Design a protein around this ligand. Structure first.
Ligand SMILES: C/C=C(/C)C(=O)O[C@H]1C(C)=C2[C@H]([C@@H]1OC(=O)CCCCCCC)[C@@](C)(OC(C)=O)C[C@H](OC(=O)CCC)[C@@]1(O)[C@H]2OC(=O)[C@@]1(C)O
Ligand code: ALF
Ligand SMILES: [Mg+2]
Length: 994
């Protein structure tokens, strides 16, 4: 039944045609079970052993790299009897690399806790229903419950399905709806219909939602919806499909892969445009069965030269080290790519209760009557320090430490708070902190009495376990609580009947201690406490009291105010009907006013300063809470979201107010307003979505189950350490210390890491640019293979793979948190830098080829072979009278290819030094700052020498250890790339922007 809250109790029974007295018939259960299904959220584990491997090769650059491997494999059979020592190594290596990068990712992604499974923990196993089978209550499986079942719930039970309340058996039905609102405050329910068909969950006070637990009371109701048709089902549904969108950096890499395929499939064709002059002459020495292989030998040569392999290993390494670095800053990272994304955060959507606050009710203000004289009435106001449930704090009279035991009014005030209280305080020995037992608004009273200590009970020597209820127990020893007149809706108040300790039952001295809403209580007061004396409640007195409650109730404070009064002469114990709540108000009349306490969920001390740091960083903070707007706006003023006296008429909306706005004005409101209160779980994710339509990298912080849809939807989901498991499993990061200042340091790292990532991304790509040009020349000019598609691999894995990771330890800027967040669409290479790295790629491509061609023309151990005959390396064993010189097997020798490799390697060792900064010369900024970069380089060099000397290594790379004559030439070609960029750096900082 949709919108059962809008219909009456009798209208819901008619919808299913079920008797409230008997229940569903076994026939009715059969039909409903087939129609609506089982009351159960569908489990979901998308990650399987096979499907996690398939998605690894879904990358475009992987597909291109894969094909080459296939091609490499095909072109390995055909080989002579002098070079057949190695043939399958290149394809084998490509395949191995492909598997390794893919395999590592799975291990760093498969290890993920399923959020839906955690959500199903809020699904009870058993349920209590009434059916036509047996007259007694049947306890069956909760999944066997169907819409129409007459379900009974009691105190401590967990609500199985979304239920329309039929009858409340107890006086009141208190319900904890923290899974939907994020507030643990008990909600008093009723059976009256809620006319508004668009009312939110906080408004549906006649409904019982699945997953929630009964705080107190017994009730009977009818099932409205089951399974995914419930409010907790809507949470489950929003936690499916594409859980996380690609990071802005991944979008840049995906943009790179797309345009890279447009180039390789054009350059190969560009070479095809060149090879025309050879097809003219009628030659049958190289038909179509051999002349087409030349295009596949350059395709795989351009593939490994274009695709920046090794980069997935460098990024993963840098991100893994960044996690451990942030781990020491109490920041647990569950998703590595979210690190880069957090640095680009411009908007932080935050939760109020438990996140911005401590989720621990604290009484901070209280006043009693000072003196009364006619129209004059002064008060004794006090302030209480402490933001936790712990008995740590003092009472302040005009910001002075004054003992509460002196004031007789405070002695009676503490007495009421101790007795008229169904809750207690407990010290968790495992966690080492004080926790509440019962109602939060009641444990606050327990904590207050402990702080006050009106009888000066020596408690500084008691253990923390015994300290919890020390001062409260002292008061209990004075007054024996006979019984309590439980809370009523017609009263908005609660009283307890107490007799003096060690006294008869027919004795005189019993008292009733009342606690409730200020309006109703004060109106039922006819007297006023002045210390130990009593004066009549007059006009001016009542008005003065109501005035202060008005101030504490609304304003910069906005406190939950409770009035405290006692019945000096209560009815006799026998003349009080306890089975009738309608008579309780008459019992709570002729009261004597004592005092008023004010309580609130206090903000954390490190929040206001943190938000300011976010504002200084160019990041705005928005509050999205399920709490009421009144406290929401107040807390916003307390932490700096709103001004102390700023007009926020059009800067704060409720859930219902937000739903009334059209889609256009809703999207706009997310950019204007900063406070959204009394919202459903779906509202939070919708606000994030709207902000993501402005291309804003938005983050989400929370701790509750109702935050899960927003935590998942946002780019960076942040969960509190002392929060729910659902919140953690649906988040990217977890604040272990529960500090909001941790986020500031996390963003600082996120910006610092990316800047270092912004360097070796350029370093590896610029290397690949020089490799493509190198292959483009030798393929379209006539020269033999200068660099084979096997050497490049080791270059883009070990030679360049090490200095790239070494650039991840570059010293970050000092003004990194004084600059607004970078644009998500900001390109890595554009403008002058696009031309700068274009010249470098052309230099490396030229330098490399020249080196291999230097071993021919101007050589020392090579045959003088000029350019007029060097390009025709194919015509040697088939054309001798026009070409002979020396040996025929010289073009495919392991000597000139090593010369090109030695230059390429040495250049990248120099290019790594140029990649230390964007527009800062090496002369100005010392190259010896990063000791790690020198190190990567040295290791690589040795490796570059290790790959030469150790004979079983140049066997597969076709290399040769250069002598003094050949090496020295390398330094004379690679080194002037330093001065090349150096000028380019000077121009960009003297003609553009430094
Ligand atoms: C590595 C091999 C090169 C040849 C290549 O294909 O990359 C291009 C291409 C894909 C882009 C270009 C390359 O374009 C060229 O260099 C033009 C080649 C013409 C030569 C022919 C003349 C005879 C990048 C490399 O140019 C240089 C000059 O820096 C910069 C940048 O790339 C980045 O910022 C790195 C992203 C990982 C991209 O414009 C990028 O495309 C866009 O999506 C970006 C944002 O990616
Ligand atoms: F703690 Al909330 F909305 F879940 F403020
Ligand atoms: Mg919360």
């Amino acid at each position: 039944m949709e919108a059962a809250h809008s219909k009456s109790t009798e209208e819901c029974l008619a919808y299913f045609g079920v008797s409230e007295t008997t229940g569903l018939t076994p026939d009715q259960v059969k039909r409903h079970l087939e129609k609506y299904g089982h009351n159960e959220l569908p489990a979901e584990e998308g990650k399987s052993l096979w499907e996690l491997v398939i998605e690894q090769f879904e990358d475009l650059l992987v597909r291109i790299l894969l094909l080459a491997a296939c091609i490499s494999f095909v072109l390995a059979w055909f080989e002579e009897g002098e070079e057949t020592i190695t043939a399958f190594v290149e394809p084998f290596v490509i395949l191995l690399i492909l598997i390794a990068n893919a395999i590592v990712g799975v291990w760093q992604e498969r290890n993920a806790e399923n959020a839906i499974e955690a959500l199903k923990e809020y699904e009870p196993e058993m349920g209590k229903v009434y059916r036509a089978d047996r007259k007694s209550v049947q306890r069956i499986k909760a999944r066997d419950i169907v819409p129409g079942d007459i379900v009974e719930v009691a105190v401590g039970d967990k609500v199985p399905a979304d239920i329309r309340i039929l009858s409340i058996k107890s006086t009141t039905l208190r319900v904890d709806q923290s899974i939907l609102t994020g507030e643990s405050v008990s909600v008093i329910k009723h059976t009256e219909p809620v006319p508004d068909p668009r009312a939110v969950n906080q408004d549906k006070k006649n409904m019982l939602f699945s997953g929630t637990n009964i705080a107190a009371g017994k009730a009977l109701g009818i099932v409205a919806t089951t399974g995914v048709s419930t409010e907790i089902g809507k949470i489950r549904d929003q936690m499916a499909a594409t859980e996380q969108d690609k990071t802005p950096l991944q979008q840049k890499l995906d943009e790179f892969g797309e345009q890279l395929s447009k180039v390789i499939s054009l350059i190969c064709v560009a070479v095809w445009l060149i090879n025309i002059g050879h097809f003219n002459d009628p030659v049958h020495g190289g038909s179509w069965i051999r002349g087409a292989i030349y295009y596949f030998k350059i395709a795989v040569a351009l593939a490994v030269a274009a695709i920046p392999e090794g980069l997935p290993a460098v990024i993963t390494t840098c991100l893994a080290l960044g996690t451990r670095r942030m781990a020491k800053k109490n920041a647990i990272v569950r998703s590595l790519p979210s690190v880069e994304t957090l640095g680009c955060t411009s908007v932080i959507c935050s939760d109020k209760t438990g996140t911005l606050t401590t989720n621990q009710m604290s009484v901070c203000k209280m006043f009693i009557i000072d003196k009364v004289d006619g129209d004059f009435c002064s008060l004794n106001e006090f302030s209480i320090t402490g933001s936790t449930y712990a008995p740590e704090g003092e009472v302040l009279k005009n910001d002075k430490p004054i003992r509460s035991g002196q004031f007789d009014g405070l002695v009676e005030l503490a007495t009421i708070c101790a007795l008229c209280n169904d809750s207690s305080l407990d010290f968790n020995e495992t966690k080492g902190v004080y926790e509440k037992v019962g109602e939060a608004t009641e444990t606050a009273l327990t904590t207050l009495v402990e702080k006050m200590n009106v009888f000066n009970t020596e408690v500084r020597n008691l253990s923390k376990v015994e300290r919890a209820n020390a001062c409260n127990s002292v008061i209990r020893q004075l007054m024996k609580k006979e019984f309590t007149l439980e809370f009523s809706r017609d009263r908005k108040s609660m009283s307890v009947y107490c007799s003096p300790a060690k006294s008869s039952r027919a004795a005189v001295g019993n008292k009733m201690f009342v606690k409730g809403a200020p309006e109703g209580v004060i109106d039922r007061c006819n007297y006023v406490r002045v210390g130990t004396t009593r004066v009549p409640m007059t006009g001016p007195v009542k008005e003065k009291i109501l005035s202060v409650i008005k101030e504490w109730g609304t304003g910069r404070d906005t406190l939950r105010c409770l009035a405290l009064a006692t019945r000096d002469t209560p009815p006799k114990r026998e003349e009080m009907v306890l089975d009738d709540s309608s008579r309780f108000m008459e019992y709570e009349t002729d009261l004597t006013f004592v005092g008023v306490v004010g309580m609130l969920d206090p903000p954390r001390k490190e929040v206001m300063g943190s938000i300011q740091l976010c504002r200084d960083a160019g990041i705005r903070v928005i509050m999205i809470t399920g709490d009421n707007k009144g406290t929401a706006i107040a807390i916003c003023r307390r932490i700096g979201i709103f001004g102390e006296n700023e007009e926020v008429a059009d800067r704060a909306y409720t859930g219902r107010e937000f739903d009334d706005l059209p889609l256009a004005e809703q999207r706009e409101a997310c950019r204007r307003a900063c406070c959204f209160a009394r919202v459903e779980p779906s509202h939070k994710s919708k606000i994030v979505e709207y902000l993501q339509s402005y291309d804003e990298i938005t983050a989400m912080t929370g701790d509750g189950v109702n935050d899960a849809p927003a935590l998942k939807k946002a780019e960076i989901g942040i969960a509190m350490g002392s929060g729910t498991a659902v919140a953690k499993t649906a988040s990217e990061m977890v604040l272990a210390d529960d500090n909001f200042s941790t986020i500031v340091a996390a963003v600082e790292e996120g910006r610092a890491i990316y800047n270092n990532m912004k360097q070796f991304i350029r370093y590896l790509i610029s290397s690949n640019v020089g490799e493509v040009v190198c292959i483009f020349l030798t393929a379209a000019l006539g020269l033999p293979e200068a660099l084979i598609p096997v050497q490049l691999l080791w270059v883009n894995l070990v030679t360049d793979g090490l200095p790239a990771t070494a650039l991840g330890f570059n010293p970050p800027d000092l003004d990194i948190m004084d600059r607004p967040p970078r644009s998500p669409k900001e390109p890595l290479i554009s403008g002058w830098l696009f031309f700068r790295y274009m010249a470098i790629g052309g230099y490396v491509g030229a330098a490399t080829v020249g080196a291999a061609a230097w071993w021919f023309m101007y050589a020392e151990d090579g045959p003088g072979v000029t350019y007029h005959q060097l390009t025709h390396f194919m015509q040697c064993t088939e054309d001798h009278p026009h070409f002979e010189g020396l040996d025929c097997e010289i073009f495919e020798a392991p000597e000139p290819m090593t010369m090109a490799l030695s230059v390429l390697v040495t250049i990248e060792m120099c290019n790594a030094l140029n990649s230390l900064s964007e527009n800062q010369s090496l002369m100005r900024m010392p190259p010896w700052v990063n000791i790690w970069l020198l190190g990567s380089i040295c290791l690589s060099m040795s490796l570059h020498f290790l790959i030469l000397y150790v004979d079983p290594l140049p066997m597969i790379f076709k290399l040769k250890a250069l002598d003094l004559t050949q090496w020295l030439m390398v330094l004379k070609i690679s080194l002037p790339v330093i001065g090349l960029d150096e000028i380019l750096k000077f121009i960009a900082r003297n003609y553009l922007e430094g």
